[PDB]
Amino acid sequence: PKIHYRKDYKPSGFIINNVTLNINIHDNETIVRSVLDMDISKHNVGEDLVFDGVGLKINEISINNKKLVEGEEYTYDNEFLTIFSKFVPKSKFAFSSEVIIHPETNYALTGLYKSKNIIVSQCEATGFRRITFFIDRPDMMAKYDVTVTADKEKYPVLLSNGDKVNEFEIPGGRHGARFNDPHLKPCYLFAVVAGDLKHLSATYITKYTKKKVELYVFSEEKYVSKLQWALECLKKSMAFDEDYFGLEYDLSRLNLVAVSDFNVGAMENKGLNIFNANSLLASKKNSIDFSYARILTVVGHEYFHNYTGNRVTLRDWFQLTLKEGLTVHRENLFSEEMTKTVTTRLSHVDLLRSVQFLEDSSPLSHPIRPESYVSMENFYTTTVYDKGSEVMRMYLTILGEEYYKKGFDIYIKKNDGNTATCEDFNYAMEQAYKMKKADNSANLNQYLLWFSQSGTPHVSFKYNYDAEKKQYSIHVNQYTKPDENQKEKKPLFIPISVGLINPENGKEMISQTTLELTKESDTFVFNNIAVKPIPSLFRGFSAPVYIEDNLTDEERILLLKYDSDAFVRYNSCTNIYMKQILMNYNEFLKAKNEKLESFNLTPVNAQFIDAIKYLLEDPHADAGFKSYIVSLPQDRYIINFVSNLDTDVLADTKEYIYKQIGDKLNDVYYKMFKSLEAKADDLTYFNDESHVDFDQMNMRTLRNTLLSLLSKAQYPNILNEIIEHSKSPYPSNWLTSLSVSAYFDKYFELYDKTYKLSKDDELLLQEWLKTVSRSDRKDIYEILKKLENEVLKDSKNPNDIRAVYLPFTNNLRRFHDISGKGYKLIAEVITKTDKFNPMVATQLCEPFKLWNKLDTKRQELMLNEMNTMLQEPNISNNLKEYLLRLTNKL
Length: 890
Ligand SMILES: Cc1cccc(CNC(=O)N[C@H](CC(C)C)C(=O)NO)c1
Ligand SMILES: [Mg+2]
Ligand SMILES: [Mg+2]
Ligand SMILES: [Mg+2]
Ligand SMILES: [Zn+2]
Description:
40% helix, protease, binds zinc ion, eight-stranded mixed beta sheet, metalloaminopeptidase activity
């Protein structure tokens, strides 16, 4: 395989200053004419001029109006256009090409493609080369003049980046529009859209310079009614970047556009952000609650890239985390601010410690700045994004808000209009650190290990209290497991946000403080500690690590009830559940393997259950928080703690724990389910697509979590409640009625009822598909076949394929059926999908990432299917690299 290495970065021998494009859309072809105004750089050594260009049909090639001929002045192999050096000018020159491409058959959704009746582009990372020839790498920055032409009836709205400088008619019922983007950019930020689009618009006035910006949001006509919340979230995003970061938008217009067929969430093309419709479009009668959160985060994310990615871009793709990690951190800050609910930060932590920790213990483990790749696309990972965000967030923890803001401003100004590297960011943060420490010898050189070292650190603690001296010590150790990336792991700079709780009264004993652990181990000592405390460690989840608190369950319960920090409270609960899960798992496992006729199970701690009841009954405690405490840890979290995991044993473990707690709490759960109804399902704001009450949404979440618990329990007459719930105007509620009815004969009636409610809205139907797919049904395999035949059919829409299959893959009992039939079904979907969309096929590989954590029969079955996929003729480079890495061959 062709391997690119971070250390081998070199600047190009060429410069592209201006790009002038004419994109002429017709029914069965698009013609792209492109002039590149180029020059020779100071790094040039008279090399051949090599352009990326994939799947292009060449009409003509010229340099300075001299036609070039295949075999004589150039070669083209369908991937690279090579202009022999004799024909490459030695000073400024014009390169012209005209190629033909076919969006109407581009089902890979990269380059220029058709999504329903909209023509749209996706260029990040390597898509621009599928539109026209270029030196397709992010350090090749240029200014763009783009003309789009098309049939006017079919494609009345034409957009590209930047200012629309002209619009004109063309004979034969066509028309054109010309765009000028004045900001230098890499080609990955180019976009064009053509469609029969409708819009909502508003004018935003910037805070400092009072610049008028016209905001447009666009969709197909059918769904124009679903654009309003996106527009509001854009206004919120713009205000937040002004208010926190002092950053103002930099063009007269910003367009956001929803398309039905999109590989991921959205894309930050300058002035022309393009979204998966599931991440831009909602209405309260037609969307579940989680859509509102998702749109807020994704709009925010793309908007924040306008500085972190666009105005300051990447030197090379190994720097991906510099824009994605930093943008996710900005997006998280924004979301926390907008929602004002503690469950926001918790949700980010839950995702990291489940999916990202799994990745980091897998054969796919990489540092947030990888050292190599074959397909850069396989590095758009939860590591690069979510661990990257936690690495970006630790700078804020270490510096505090004022000095963090200073460092960020150093970075953003210094590198404006240019490329940057992770080192540039660390250098800016290090300038702030020196100022904070008032010591120009302080440095953050150790911090760089967070970019280069893979794997999750393990941090463990020991405590000692001397009552005569009123003196308390916290001794801390860190360990990272050696791996394929580093055989010897070095200690990191780990910030440990800490409090100390008095167990006698539940109160805070110290000003919160941040311990800076820089060695493999260290002991932090506190004086004037009046009684033995219970430590409150890694407040806010202050570093991306495995925490071993070495606390008793009695101490954990005291923190769950009385600590101030939502993460420590949640983590203390998590830890009590993990101790129980591992103990019961081992009990069940021994019983199974020893074929015992009788055995014991350790009961769930009765004081913990009493604590759960106390919190649930507190009318002043948070509804969202409550929903986390009655839920066991996610399976992907649990599996980080078990080797050779028997998934059936784990399923039996979780069922036993849930049943123990419900046997004590179900009546509490029912009383709460009823008592929360009035406030949860209040219709204030039901017609207001500009405002969401996130606390009220967390109440619905709690109700729906409780309803699931009671339904699984067969609580008496709960079917009555399920049927009433299916009549609620909130889709979150009526789709929950379908999933919780899985435990009853009424499931197929609710399946039909909710289908009819869902089938006329593309996105609501996809949410119905997910609801069916995750249903806890013994007959799930026959239900999947019914979805395939009756609803999915031949769809190539990634959202339809993902909706049908991914939730089902999280069904611990059924997906991991010891026959292997679950593994076979998903492997067939992967292979099928790879024939037209390699990026989506690699997404669908997700359940296989934990293969080497499973018991040896399941390991063998997963491995069999992975190797079968690898044998498929014409397997994509994306899928083949992924699977070779995952199976320890690469
Ligand atoms: C964790 C993670 C891995 C890969 C991709 C994503 C995010 N979904 C997106 O929409 N990502 C895009 C990538 C573009 C190249 C489409 C993004 O970062 N938009 O800013 C998450
Ligand atoms: Mg082609
Ligand atoms: Mg997010
Ligand atoms: Mg469709
Ligand atoms: Zn992004």
